[PDB]
Amino acid sequence: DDTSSSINFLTRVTGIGPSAARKLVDEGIKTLEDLRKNEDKLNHHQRIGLKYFEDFEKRIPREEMLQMQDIVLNEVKKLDPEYIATVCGSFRRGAESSGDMDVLLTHPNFTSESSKQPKLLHRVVEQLQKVRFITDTLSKGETKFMGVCQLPSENEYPHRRIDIRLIPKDQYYCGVLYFTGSDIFNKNMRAHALEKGFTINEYTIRPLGVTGVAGEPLPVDSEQDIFDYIQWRYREPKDRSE
Ligand SMILES: [Mn+2]
């Protein structure tokens, strides 16, 4: 019946999760328009997603995606060149079009020992915002920022999603890998590694042992070393389809 159809539409709104989509229905909030007239029932997120519904639905061609990546890469560089920033996802893998952006970021100042340096992220979030790259914010945490951005014009672009994550320098690589994917490639790689006596996750690559209950994180300073640990020729990102 023409209502299940409603819950579904809700969830189409970033922010609006299921349990959240339901209560909204209970207020009779079902359509797009039912939302619009009711910004008060929604969080900043949900409101933002809704503001951007339409654009959020479109995809990013790499022509754009790249120009985006230029901007992120360049700005972090001027705040502090000790900032490593890899925009990952399918995109990295040559994908012709992308859903969202996701910048992975690190700084040697930050390791899995400090954990308390949101300014590290913030500073860029703020930086990105003064340029009018990031144009809205969904949810800005200490280690991760969900927001919205948009390329500049001279006369326009949709608002893409953008995620920036802060990762320790001692775990960046593993994560650069992991958010690189594809989901399959990770499975297989994670699958291969297991055989050599290793366990790779999004943070580390640990050596296994007897009864599995084991690990103690090998140093990683490039994605390359991951591969070396498990001796597989490094497959460039483009060759990680499976
Ligand atoms: Mn994302």
Question: What 3 state SS string does 70-92 have?
Answer: HHHHHHHHHHCCCCEEEECCCCC
> 42 with 145, same domain?
no
Q: Ligand 1 centroid to 165 CA: how many Å?
A: 10
Tokens 């945490």, residue located: 141
Please tell me whether residue 173 adopts helix, strand or coil conformation: helix
Give the closest residue to 162 by CA, choosing from 173, 170, 151: 151
Q: Ligand 1 centroid to 101 CA: how many Å?
A: 6
Rounded to a whole number of angstroms, the distance between the first and last alpha carbons of the chain is 40
Q: How far apart are alpha carbons 25 and 19 in whole angstroms?
A: 10
At which of 112, 140, 172 does a domain end?
A: 172
> 137 with 178, same domain?
no
Contact 149, 160 (CB under 8 A): yes
Q: Ligand 1 centroid to 173 CA: how many Å?
A: 18
Q: H-helix or E-strand containing 102?
A: strand 101-106
Q: Ligand 1 centroid to 36 CA: how many Å?
A: 24
At which of 137, 157, 172 does a domain end?
A: 172
Q: Ligand 1 centroid to 115 CA: how many Å?
A: 22
The response to whether 2 counts as a known ligand-binding position is no
Q: What is the tally of structural domains in the chain?
A: 3
- AA identity, residue 226: I
Q: Ligand 1 centroid to 214 CA: how many Å?
A: 32
| Pairing of the two strands 60-61 and 97-98 | antiparallel
The response to whether 59 counts as a known ligand-binding position is yes
Q: Kindly provide the resolution of this structure in angstroms, with one decimal.
A: 2.8
The response to whether 102 counts as a known ligand-binding position is yes
The response to whether 99 counts as a known ligand-binding position is yes
> 143 with 67, same domain?
yes
- Those residues whose beta carbon sits under 5 angstroms from the ion ligand 1 are 100, 102, 163
Technique used by the depositors:
X-ray
Please give the structure tokens belonging to residue 193: 């590694």
Write 131-134 long-range contacts (CB < 8 A, 24+). Answer: 131/71, 131/75, 133/68, 133/71, 133/72, 133/75, 134/162
What residue numbers bound the domain in which 183 lies?
173-241
> 129 with 197, same domain?
no
| Helix-then-strand count for the chain, H and E | 10, 9
- AA identity, residue 177: L
> 107 with 180, same domain?
no
Q: Ligand 1 centroid to 202 CA: how many Å?
A: 16
Q: How far apart are alpha carbons 143 and 186 in whole angstroms?
A: 23
> 45 with 79, same domain?
no
> 27 with 83, same domain?
no
The response to whether 93 counts as a known ligand-binding position is yes
Q: How far apart are alpha carbons 79 and 127 in whole angstroms?
A: 8
DSSP class of residue 216 equals -
Contact 56, 101 (CB under 8 A): no
> 15 with 104, same domain?
no
Q: Ligand 1 centroid to 79 CA: how many Å?
A: 24
> 70 with 157, same domain?
yes
> 70 with 167, same domain?
yes
> 142 with 222, same domain?
no
Q: What is the CATH number of the domain that holds 51?
A: 1.10.150.20
Prior bond of 182 cis (ω within 30°): yes
> 149 with 92, same domain?
yes
Please give the structure tokens belonging to residue 54: 């339409």
At residue 189, φ and ψ (nearest 5 deg) are: -70, -45
Q: What is the CATH number of the domain that holds 213?
A: 3.30.210.10
The response to whether 125 counts as a known ligand-binding position is no
At which of 172, 188, 210 does a domain end?
A: 172
